[PDB]
Amino acid sequence: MEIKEVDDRAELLRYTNNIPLLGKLVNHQPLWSTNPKLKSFSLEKISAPDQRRVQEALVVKDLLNVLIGLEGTYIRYFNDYEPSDPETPIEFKIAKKMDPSFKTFSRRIVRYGKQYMILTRAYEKWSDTSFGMVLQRFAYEIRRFLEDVYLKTLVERLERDFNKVPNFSIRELEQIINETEVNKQMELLYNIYEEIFREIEERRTNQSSHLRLMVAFDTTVYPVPKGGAILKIFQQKILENLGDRSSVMFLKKLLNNISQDYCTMLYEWLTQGILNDPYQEFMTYDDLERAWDTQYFIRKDVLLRDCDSEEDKNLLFKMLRTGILLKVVRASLQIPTIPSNSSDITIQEINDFADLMEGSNLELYVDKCYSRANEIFLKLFFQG
Amino acid sequence: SSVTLRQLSNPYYVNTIPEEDILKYVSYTLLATTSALFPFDHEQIQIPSKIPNFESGLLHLIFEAGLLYQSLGYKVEKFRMLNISPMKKALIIEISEELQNYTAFVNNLVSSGTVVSLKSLYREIYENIIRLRIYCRFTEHLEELSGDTFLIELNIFKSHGDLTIRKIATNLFNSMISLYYEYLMNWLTKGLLRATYGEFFIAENTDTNGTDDDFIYHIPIEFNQERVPAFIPKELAYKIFMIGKSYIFLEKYCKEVQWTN
Question: Where does the record say this protein resides (chain A)?
């Protein structure tokens, strides 16, 4: 195919004030559709049954690029694609002059490149501090997935077979993608994306829409669901994948690797009385960051459970009180931390969120923490 | 059939440069050096028409590392010539270490001979790209910016959900806080304010107008409460201030030299 001249020069982007911490810092390549570097070859010319395999070879070469988010020579980014725009949806168009059987395979394969790019871009957006550590860890896991699973499979298996295997074919690509279940993993991630995304849009849309404790609610709904608001998505998705052991296993693993810092934060609150929430994802926030009798606020929107039932309200308050008593003790003793040997009650870290949320376990975990907080507190008050 | 699809697609790409040749010059691009295939201009990499846009899209994704590398290398070289706070040197040094690790990694991939394609290469260096991007953004403002501000920002990032980010922020933080600690020691053990470049909350103030030019009524030490870092209790910062002031008083005016030493 004849070569066309395009002044293709790679450079770093000048404006970073509008780029997420993990966003791309390099200009996109010139597009085929406006600046092809090659005269195209109509595939019509090789539609013949004896040349048909060649047509397929050319099509597969594009599919490999489509899967990693690049346009090809027969499959192109659609008409409104705008590579400099983080908000532009991406669709692909398939050259009309193509064997119709390939055109249908292509649509089925192409959709994954679409998901790939979306997930890629989404995790980059989520690298901002504005989204919270729960989402950021998820964004991490997405990125990690793509590096180690998606692309690894693609290169080790598909690029490799394209280059090395006689009888390698387009029908095989479909089989392999499903064979490794990478598409299910992506489909789940994609659907999580869609769920959070639509949730964000709903939130964005809705701009107009006994204990001696200073406990106020903060009914603010955040544009970005954070903390429990995210963890709930995962829980709900698991509940929608019931019976698919592979899928739920994946989702559970994933959730436990997302909730890990959340759990740590909760643990310290409950065993140390330490509030440390730089991204404002934890319920129970207060002022100042003397004057110790400050108000505590409950971010209803980041809660793991509703606070409408009596039982969960009671649990929430117990968790709150637990940390407060510990906070008092740390202040009173002028210590950074309360050691495990400060009491006869020792409490293990939360290392499995999903398990903690299985029912009853949370209440007991908290009760143990609470009991401990009182043991320590009372010893101080009646001895110290 | 008897051939792979690559063999069949081949005859249409005969006018273009194969991946073998591209890989032979990629290692140079990745270290931001120039080459015969990819002349590396001051800030741009020239891609020949002989490499289709099909592959160019990947090369941009790959080449970004070389460009980021270059940018960080310049940040290092610029600052290497300046009289700056040790706190910045700590950041700079960490950048140089990252660049050294980057380099070794890249050289190892190339020398291993196991990279046979660009898709493979890209995937293999994917993480390094991410790491450089993180640093590149952290160094974006490494100019007109104090050491404490950086420590604060890093503390935010130390809590970031992304594992790579928190590791990087942590390492940068630790490299810098170590020298912050040294400032505290100089003050606490010597009453010394040295090489702070305005990046330490306790300051010398000898800008007098006859109001004790000889420092017999006051010791020309003051501190900015607003510059006390987040990790030091304000009350303690006060004690720190007073210890060094007391040190000075005793050593300089009371001449309690044997004791003080």
Answer: Nucleus; Cytoplasm, Cytoskeleton, Microtubule organizing center, Spindle pole body
Report the distance separating Cα A186 and Cα A112, nearest Å. 8
Q: Which helix (H) or strand (E) holds A298?
A: strand A296-299
Q: To the nearest 5 percent, what fractions of chain B are helix, strand and coil? A: 65, 5, 35
Query: For A222, left (φ over 0), alpha (ψ -120 to 50), or beta?
Result: beta
Listed by number, the residues of chain A in 114-153 with a beta carbon closer than 8 Å to a beta carbon of chain B are: 127, 129, 132-140, 143, 147, 151-152
| Greatest alpha-carbon span in chain A | 95
Query: What's the CA angle centered on A99, arms A93 and A101, to 5 degrees?
Result: 90
- For residue B41, the chain A residues in CB contact (below 8 A) are 9
Contacts for A254-259: CB closer than 8 Å, 24+ residues apart: A254/A138, A254/A141, A255/A231, A255/A353, A255/A354, A256/A352, A256/A353, A256/A354, A257/A137, A257/A141, A258/A134, A258/A137, A258/A138, A258/A141, A258/A230, A258/A231, A258/A234, A259/A134, A259/A231, A259/A353, A259/A354
d(CA A158, CA B205): 69
Given CA atoms A120, A126, A128, A129 in this order, what sign does their dihedral have? Answer: negative
Beta bridge partners of A12: A26
Query: Are B4 and A168 in contact (CB < 8 Å)?
Result: yes
- The torsion angles phi and psi of B43, rounded to 5 degrees, stand at -130, 10
- How many angstroms separate the CA atoms of B170 and B177, rounded? 10
Q: Please, what's the b/e burial string for B131-149 (b: 16 or more CB within 10 A of its CB; e: otherwise)?
A: bbbbbbbbbeebeeebbbe
Q: What is the DSSP pairing of strand A75-77 with strand A9-10?
A: unpaired
CB A125 within 8 A of CB A20: yes
